[PDB]
Design a protein around this ligand. Structure first.
Ligand SMILES: [Mg+2]
Lengths: 269, 50, 49, 50, 36
RNA sequence: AGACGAACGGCGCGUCUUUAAACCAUGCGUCGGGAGCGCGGCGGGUUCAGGAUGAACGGCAAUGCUGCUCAUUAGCGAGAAGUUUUUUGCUUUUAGAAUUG
DNA sequence: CAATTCTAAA
């Protein structure tokens, strides 16, 4: 089923492209990237990094319009770099930690709406969504004096300073919380298809891994140990899987499976 | 569930889960097993609901 | 002592059943510990749990 | 000792030791033995009393 | 110890660690050469 | 005939022969330490530093050392032998029949 | 429903 794996690979490339684009769209991710590059501190790499610096300064000088086409051409000129596993994972980790903080802010704010006043979900979704920073939810909610709009002054003040803490975190980020949630939605979208990719890979590849593992049945080691050890070996083999090979799938598994089973029987048997 | 039209109690099995995952990775907090139910019990508050 | 295992002759025993049950539970818990050590994939830990 | 009970479960060869479980009259029962009656399974050496 | 009433309730994990004296690790029981 | 087997000893027993090893792995089997406090301290852990090991440590702690003073066990029932040793010890439940008050 | 026999199935 070469279609599944080739789709998974190209779409993983798409997902990492999208999150890198969001990083280019996000200030402090770029500050972290340049900080760690300076800490690590090839002429092609050096001139590419000089181009990155020039791009960063010109884009941050031109925040005011053409910045959309500007970040588009930043996206196409920023994708020439191959992503190291550790570095990419760490940058993704930091920016998802930002995402977790923003999620915590979201969490805190809608506890201040949902249960304390038994807010209807549909009405809150329709009304609150869209602005997130205005009086459209602070003292416009009291405006219509609907049955869920009289016991909000008692909580509007904690909503208040919670959201000023939220805007403090906003200037900590730099681009308005609407924009931040949009880009976070974009990266989460790409990551969602990435997880679907690995999901499809494992679910379709279950049959292949059990089929290759079934070759051994009289080792004396449990059929269970066979399957999980073979599976883990095949997964770490697939983690850098190449579709360019003309060889079939089982060819790219026998040695890893064999060594994993050998270690298993040697250790616990 | 958060601001994603998700209900705290609705149960969605594997294939609807795949669909929802594609709809949303975040704000659909996919937890499974005892841990899931355990976490849920922590969220619920008694006296207000009481 | 509440679940004694009489040594009557070798491995065979006159015992309360619980030795077996504890043995099984400890085995499976150790196995799950191994999985979480090795970062195996989802469905395997699904079967484990 | 060790290596013996293991051998005991493996094949088993016990020392020719002796224990006695004769039939004693249950206590508080006087008597006067008026008859004895012996049964032997076919194909065994008999006894003088038989 | 000469008590006067029994209270029953659920056992918090801290209590479960309070009662015991140390974690139990291996499924093995005895030496099987000795009975130690 | 002696040696070693987590500290000492007795005995058991594995191996070796003037040597302390080896085997094994909560590093073998089994009995014993009239006394409590004191002295230091085998053994075994903690902290630190060194870069694969050195130092310090006292909760505790062995073989020992100078001292102060609190006084001597045992399941049950059968059985054996000579105040002393020694053997043994239950498939009980589930029903059914007859008979008591 | 307290024993007292005997039998039979694990
Ligand atoms: Mg009467």
């Amino acid at each position: 089923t070469r279609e599944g794996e080739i789709d998974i690979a190209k779409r993983i490339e798409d997902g990492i492209n999208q999150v890198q684009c969001s990083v280019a769209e996000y200030p402090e991710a770029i500050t972290y990237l340049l900080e760690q590059y300076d800490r690590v501190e090839p002429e092609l790499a050096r001139e590419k990094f000089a181009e990155l610096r020039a791009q960063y300064v010109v884009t941050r000088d031109t925040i005011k319009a053409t910045a959309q086409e500007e970040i588009l051409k930043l996206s196409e000129v920023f994708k020439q770099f191959r992503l190291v596993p550790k570095q990419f994972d760490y940058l993704v980790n930091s920016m998802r930690v930002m995402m977790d903080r923003v999620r915590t802010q979201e969490r805190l704010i809608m506890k201040l709406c949902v249960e304390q006043c038994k807010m209807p979900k549909k009405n809150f979704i329709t009304l609150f969504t869209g602005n997130e920073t205005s009086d459209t939810w602070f003292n416009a909610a009291i405006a219509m004096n609907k049955p869920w709009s009289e016991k909000l002054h008692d909580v509007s003040e904690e909503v208040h300073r919670a959201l000023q803490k939220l805007q403090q975190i906003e200037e900590e980020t730099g681009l308005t919380i609407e924009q931040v949630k949009d880009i976070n939605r974009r990266m989460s979208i790409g990551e969602a298809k990435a997880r679907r990719a690995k999901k499809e890979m494992v679910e379709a590849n279950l049959r292949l891994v059990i089929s290759i593992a079934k070759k051994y049945t009289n080792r004396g080691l449990q059929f269970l140990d066979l399957i999980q050890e073979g599976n883990i070996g095949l997964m770490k083999a697939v983690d850098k899987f190449e579709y360019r090979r003309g060889y079939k799938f089982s060819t790219y598994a026998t040695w890893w499976i064999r060594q994993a089973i050998t270690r298993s029987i040697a250790d616990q048997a | 569930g958060g601001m994603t039209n998700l209900e705290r109690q609705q149960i969605l099995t594997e294939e609807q889960y795949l669909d929802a995952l594609e709809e949303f990775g975040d704000e659909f907090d996919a937890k499974m097993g005892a841990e899931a139910i355990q976490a849920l019990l922590k969220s619920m508050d008694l006296e207000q609901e009481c | 002592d509440l679940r004694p295992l009489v040594p009557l002759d070798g491995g065979r025993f006159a015992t309360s059943d619980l030795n077996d049950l504890y043995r099984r539970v400890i085995n499976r818990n150790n196995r799950l510990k191994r999985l979480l050590d090795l970062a195996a994939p989802d469905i395997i830990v699904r079967n484990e749990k | 000792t060790p290596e013996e009970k293991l051998l005991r479960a493996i094949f088993g060869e016990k020392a020719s030791d002796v224990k006695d479980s004769s039939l004693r009259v249950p206590n508080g029962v006087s008597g006067t033995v008026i008859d004895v009656q012996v049964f032997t399974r076919d194909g065994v050496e008999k006894d003088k009393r038989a | 110890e000469e008590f006067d009433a029994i209270k029953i309730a659920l056992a918090s994990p801290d209590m479960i660690r309070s009662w015991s004296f140390g974690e139990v690790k291996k499924p093995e029981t005895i030496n099987y050469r000795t009975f130690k």
